[PDB]
């Protein structure tokens, strides 16, 4: 059904984006919570791939910011290109060797390939984890941007939280791929001024909401050094049970975009409140956000 012409002769270049895909690009990942791939995929291919989901919106497949789930083999066998990205194991095959622990899953139940458009008209993006907790079973969350010749003021950008550091914005350049992690990288998307496209792809991990992540040590070692302590912190998801305290005013202003609703605002109101009677919690929460200001 897609016609099958392309405005720029590509390769369809599997080695390309496993070498992409380094040992240092998974170290970083694993060590700093997120890393950038810049011209990752190429630029005929990236645009090869695009040209499929415009067609996917043309043909009226994106639903109701619009998106589309690429599970279904029907809608893929229209897409080849994108088809083809979602029988690709070339990210898998890199993750798993770099980073064995992450215990990631092959089949395809345990991934999900995601398409989305957003039109541009500012809207509603709160802050969060890919992975908030409870049932989900995302590891990995992998970001293909598709925007050619995006400019400073088209907006759009994802701003990560790595947990008590400064912010990292990240522009949605073409063929750039953002790799993070689901279950301890916090974020949200700035408003778009400019349409926006984005392929997401997640990757499941079979040990990932585990009890041993629930949970902080505090050792005798900590005393001597808060930083092993502060560290440890921000590569634990055990973070998502404190970002909306110490993230308030973050998470508040999105919420200030939302409402430019009410029970999402309710909620947050709720929860800041029940965090501040729990003395403990908040005493905790307050020197967290006391680090977070002398860095
Ligand atoms: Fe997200």
């Given at each position: 059904?897609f016609?099958?012409?392309?405005?720029?002769s590509?390769?369809r270049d599997?080695?390309?984006?496993?070498?992409?895909?380094?040992?240092?690009?998974?170290?970083?990942?694993?060590?700093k919570?997120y890393?950038?791939?810049?011209?990752?995929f190429?630029?005929?291919?990236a645009?090869?791939?695009?040209?499929?989901?415009?067609?996917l919106?043309?043909?009226?497949?994106?639903?109701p910011?619009?998106?589309?789930?690429?599970?279904?083999?029907?809608l893929?066998?229209?897409?080849?290109e994108?088809?083809?990205?979602?029988h690709?194991?070339e990210?898998?095959?890199?993750?798993?060797?770099?980073?064995?622990?992450y215990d990631?899953?092959?089949?395809?139940?345990?991934?999900?390939?995601?398409?989305?458009?957003?039109?541009?008209?500012?809207?509603?993006?709160?802050?969060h984890?890919?992975?908030?907790?409870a049932?989900?079973?995302?590891?990995?969350?992998?970001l293909?941007?598709?925007?050619?010749?995006?400019?400073?003021?088209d907006?759009g950008?994802?701003q990560?939280?790595?947990?008590?550091?400064?912010?990292?914005?990240?522009?949605?350049?073409?063929?750039?791929?953002?790799?993070?992690?689901?279950?301890?990288?916090?974020?949200?998307?700035?408003?778009s001024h400019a349409?926006?496209?984005?392929?997401?792809i997640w990757?499941?991990?079979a040990?990932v909401?585990?009890?041993?992540?629930?949970?902080?040590?505090?050792t005798?070692?900590?005393?001597?050094?808060?930083?092993?302590?502060?560290?440890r912190?921000?590569?634990?998801?055990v973070?998502?049970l404190?970002?909306?305290?110490?993230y308030?005013?973050?998470?508040?202003?999105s919420?200030?975009?939302c409402?430019?609703?009410?029970?999402?605002?309710?909620?947050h109101?709720?929860?800041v409140?029940?965090?501040?009677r729990?003395g403990?919690?908040?005493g905790?929460?307050?020197?967290l956000?006391?680090?977070?200001?002398?860095?």
């Amino acid at each position: 059904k897609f016609p099958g012409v392309y405005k720029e002769s590509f390769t369809r270049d599997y080695e390309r984006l496993h070498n992409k895909i380094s040992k240092e690009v998974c170290d970083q990942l694993d060590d700093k919570g997120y890393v950038v791939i810049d011209d990752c995929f190429g630029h005929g291919w990236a645009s090869a791939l695009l040209e499929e989901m415009r067609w996917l919106n043309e043909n009226d497949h994106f639903k109701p910011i619009f998106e589309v789930d690429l599970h279904d083999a029907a809608l893929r066998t229209k897409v080849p290109e994108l088809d083809a990205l979602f029988h690709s194991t070339e990210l898998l095959q890199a993750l798993t060797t770099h980073l064995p622990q992450y215990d990631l899953q092959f089949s395809t139940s345990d991934r999900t390939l995601k398409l989305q458009r957003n039109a541009g008209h500012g809207g509603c993006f709160p802050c969060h984890y890919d992975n908030p907790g409870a049932p989900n079973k995302r590891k990995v969350t992998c970001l293909l941007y598709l925007n050619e010749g995006w400019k400073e003021g088209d907006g759009g950008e994802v701003q990560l939280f790595p947990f008590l550091q400064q912010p990292v914005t990240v522009a949605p350049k073409m063929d750039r791929v953002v790799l993070f992690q689901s279950d301890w990288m916090l974020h949200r998307v700035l408003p778009s001024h400019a349409e926006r496209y984005v392929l997401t792809i997640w990757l499941d991990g079979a040990k990932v909401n585990a009890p041993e992540d629930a949970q902080l040590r505090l050792t005798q070692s900590d005393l001597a050094d808060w930083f092993g302590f502060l560290e440890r912190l921000r590569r634990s998801p055990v973070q998502r049970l404190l970002s909306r305290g110490v993230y308030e005013e973050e998470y508040y202003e999105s919420l200030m975009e939302c409402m430019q609703c009410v029970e999402l605002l309710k909620s947050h109101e709720t929860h800041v409140e029940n965090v501040k009677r729990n003395g403990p919690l908040y005493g905790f929460i307050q020197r967290l956000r006391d680090v977070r200001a002398m860095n």
